[PDB]
Every structure is written in C-alpha cells, then in structure tokens.
C-alpha cells in the first residue's frame, strides 16, 4: 500500500526490510502517511 500511493526508492526499500532504524525513523518523522499507523497500531497492541 506504501509502495504504490507513494514511491519507495530502491535504496530505501532495501533498508525498510532490514528494518533499519534510520530510513524508518525518517518517514514516520518526515512524511507521516500510512507508516504512522503500522507503527502506532503496534503501540496500541502492546496493551497487556
């Protein structure tokens, strides 16, 4: 969903897999679309 309505450089992508800190931090910090749910949702999940 991210790759389409958007446009993930081969460079980035290759990081967004290794779950790199940076490249991930960027988006969530910069952009703000989707990414900010996949993340957040997790927080909401560690509800215990």
């Amino acid at each position: 969903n991210l790759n389409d309505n958007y446009g993930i450089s081969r460079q980035q992508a290759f990081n967004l897999l290794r779950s790199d800190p940076r490249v991930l931090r960027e988006f969530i910090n910069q952009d703000n679309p989707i990414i900010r749910n996949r993340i957040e949702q997790l927080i909401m999940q560690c509800r215990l």
Binding site: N1, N3, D4, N5, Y6, G7, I8, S9, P33, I34
Partner: protein, 397 residues
C-alpha cells in the same frame, strides 16, 4: 496532445473498419489518413519509461504503406496490416502510461514526458482527426477558453465526512440535541436528534440545519430527496467529541417537519423546495442547505406518550432526518463518478508501476483528499491525466 488522440481513433476506426471482406470504398477516406501517419513518423525515434518500476523502451519507425490498389479485401491484406497495428498499440500504451504518471506544479497542464513533449512539435500536427470523443471534445473547447462540460451518473462531489455536532450536551450525555451526518460521493444523510423531544422548546419545535459546500459547482443535477436518514435510525454507542468517553443514541423516528432544501450559488438561492420528496432538479449550485424540524407530537396515544416523559431520564431519542442523492449532474471540472473508469485507470497504472508520490496528487490519488483540496493545479493535472486515460481506453481496457 490532440495529436495523441488521433493516433488512437486512427487505430480503433482501423482495427474496426478493416476486415476480411468489405469494399475499399468504405475505407478509402480512412486508408489515406492512416498512411499519412506512417510517413510523418518514420525516421523519428522515441523513448518511454524510466520512472519507478516502469521499464524503459525505445521505438523506431520504418514501415511500408498500404495497397490503395485492391477492390475488396483479402485475408492476406489484413494480417500484413494487423502486424503493423500491434506495434503501435503496444506503443501508445507505453506512451500513455509514461505521461499518466508525471505531475507538475508550475505548469501541470502541459505535457511532461520526453515522449509526448516531442509530439506537440509542429511537424506532427499533420495527423489530427475526428475529435468526437467527449473528453477531447472538451479538452479543445477549454484551450479556446469556452464553456466546457461533462456528464456524470452518481458524481463524486462530497469528500467523505461522517461526524456530529452536539448543540446541547452535558457530561452524562443523557439529554443531547444536535445533528449527525454522512456526506460521501453523491449522497448526504443527516439526522437531527433532541433527547427531550422539544419538551421545553418554543412551539415544541426544534430546528435543525445541515449545510454542505461543494468544491465545484454542479449544474443540471437530477436529485432524489427522501425523508428519514436510515443510517442514523438505529441504536449507537458513539465516542464523545473529546474522545474521552462514549454516549448512547437510541433513536425513535418522526417525520421531518417544515423541510426546506435550498441549492445556492454564491450565497443566492437558485432552487428551493419545501417538503418535496422524490425527484427534484437543482440547475446550478455550489451549496446545499437542508433545514428541517422536530416537532413534538401534539397528540399522542399512550404508547407514544410513554416514550416522551416530562422529566428525565430520556430513554427514547426523537430523531428526524433527510436523505439526498445526486443521481446525475454536469460539472465544468473533471470529477470521479459511479460509471467512468478514469480515476481508477490513473490510480491503477500508478499503483502497478510503483510510481513514487509526486508534488501534486495526494498519496494513492486518494479521492477524498483530492476533492477536499481541489486546487487549480490538481484539476489541471487531473484533467490532463483523465483525458489520457480516456484516449488509452479506446484501445486498451
């Protein structure tokens, strides 16, 4: 651009009117046009693709003409032709797609791709022909700066909006008064609720109002207006305005009283309808205003009287509503609707080729976001991009 158009109607009226049999005379006028093309092309060289996951492809031209000789058409004639068409088809597809992805702020109207920029060149203009395809028809009329116009079934003018406004509320949310609605696409549903059933209201009547401002004017609209908002006629547990808690809505529906729909244009009432349900015409408007009231029933059978006590708790919540649907309308600006595949074509090509988000369109060509902030740049780009999608659909679906 117009150039582009032709290229297709050429092929369509081609892959269509050229078949094993028919008389030359029915295509004589056509054949010509065709050849004329090949010529202008041959010698020239192109390049498409290069962005995102889109393949880069180069194309050259060096083709023979057409036998303007024969009387009838023999199978062999076709096959030697179809072979030439297929290269152009597979071409145009790549041409369209390549220009159907690029966006631009400054000049988001003119061509972008190396492929098309080259076409607007003068030396190719020798190909225009038969512009009866509704979209190109309007593309031109806009260049000459004149009155355009398209046709839509269940247009998509309302950005999704589902919310409420509590005009009277308190922490317990046990005696509320306000409205809740859903504006989406071509439809509006709005309900006005008063937990007290206008027990202390002047004339035992509570007034409601719902205003919707269109981002573009719609003319010639055929509209269905019906009493009641089914969407807001059932029990709900809703989040409070501040998100801190949840309230209970337990509706009981009464007929909306003194219904008045106004279709305004720049603040002026263009059309007004008083309690008229069914099919109504709104000929030119940029705003819809729905006013309706809840009137406490002056006479109540015991069963009804029991729902509306003089004092709290108010357990049955009096609700009145309206439903309005724009079946068809004309707009001077391109819009998504329930029948045309333009938005879906553009969105689909971009998604399939992993096209990166650009500077003009919202991520994913999101309709709600697009129509909410429908800037001139987004509209010019949308029209360019929709017109190309329509050119493409003449050959590739």
């Amino acid at each position: 651009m117009d150039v582009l158009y032709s290229l297709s109607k050429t092929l369509k009226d081609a892959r269509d009117k050229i078949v094993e049999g028919t008389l030359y005379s029915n295509v004589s006028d056509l054949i010509q046009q065709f050849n004329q093309m090949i010529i202008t092309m041959n010698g020239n060289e192109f390049q498409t693709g290069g962005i995102g996951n889109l393949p880069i492809r180069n194309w050259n031209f060096d083709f023979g003409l057409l036998g303007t000789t024969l009387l009838n058409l023999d199978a062999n004639y076709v096959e030697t032709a179809r072979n030439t068409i297929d290269y152009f088809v597979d071409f145009v597809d790549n041409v369209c797609m390549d220009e159907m992805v690029r966006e631009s702020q400054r000049n988001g109207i003119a061509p972008q791709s190396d492929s098309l920029r080259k076409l607007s060149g003068i030396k190719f203009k020798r190909i225009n022909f038969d512009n009866s395809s509704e979209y190109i028809e309007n593309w031109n009329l806009q260049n000459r700066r004149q009155r355009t116009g398209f046709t839509f079934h269940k247009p998509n003018i309302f950005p999704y909006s589902a919310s409420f406004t509590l005009n009277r509320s308190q922490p317990a949310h046990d005696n509320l008064m306000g409205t809740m609605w859903l504006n989406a696409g071509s439809e509006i549903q709005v309900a006005g609720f008063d937990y007290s059933c206008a027990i202390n209201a002047p004339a035992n009547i509570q007034q409601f109002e719902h205003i919707v401002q269109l981002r573009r004017v719609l003319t010639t609209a055929t509209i269905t207006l019906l009493p009641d908002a089914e969407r807001f006629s059932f029990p709900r547990v809703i989040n409070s305005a501040d998100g801190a808690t949840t309230w209970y809505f337990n509706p009981v529906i009464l007929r909306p009283n003194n219904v008045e729909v106004e279709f305004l244009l720049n603040g002026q009432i263009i059309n007004t309808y008083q309690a008229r349900f069914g099919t109504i015409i709104a000929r030119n408007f940029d705003t819809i205003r729905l006013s309706f009231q809840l009137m406490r029933p002056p006479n109540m059978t015991p069963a009804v009287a029991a729902l509306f006590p003089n004092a709290q708790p108010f357990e049955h919540h009096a609700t009145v509503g309206l439903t309005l649907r724009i079946e068809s309308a004309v707009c001077e600006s391109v819009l998504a609707d329930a029948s045309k595949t333009m938005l879906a074509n553009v969105t689909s090509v971009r998604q399939e080729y992993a096209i990166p988000v650009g500077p003009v369109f919202p991520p994913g060509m999101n309709w709600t976001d697009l129509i909410t902030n429908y800037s001139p740049s987004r509209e010019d780009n949308l029209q360019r991009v929709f017109t190309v999608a329509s050119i493409r659909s003449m050959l590739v679906k």
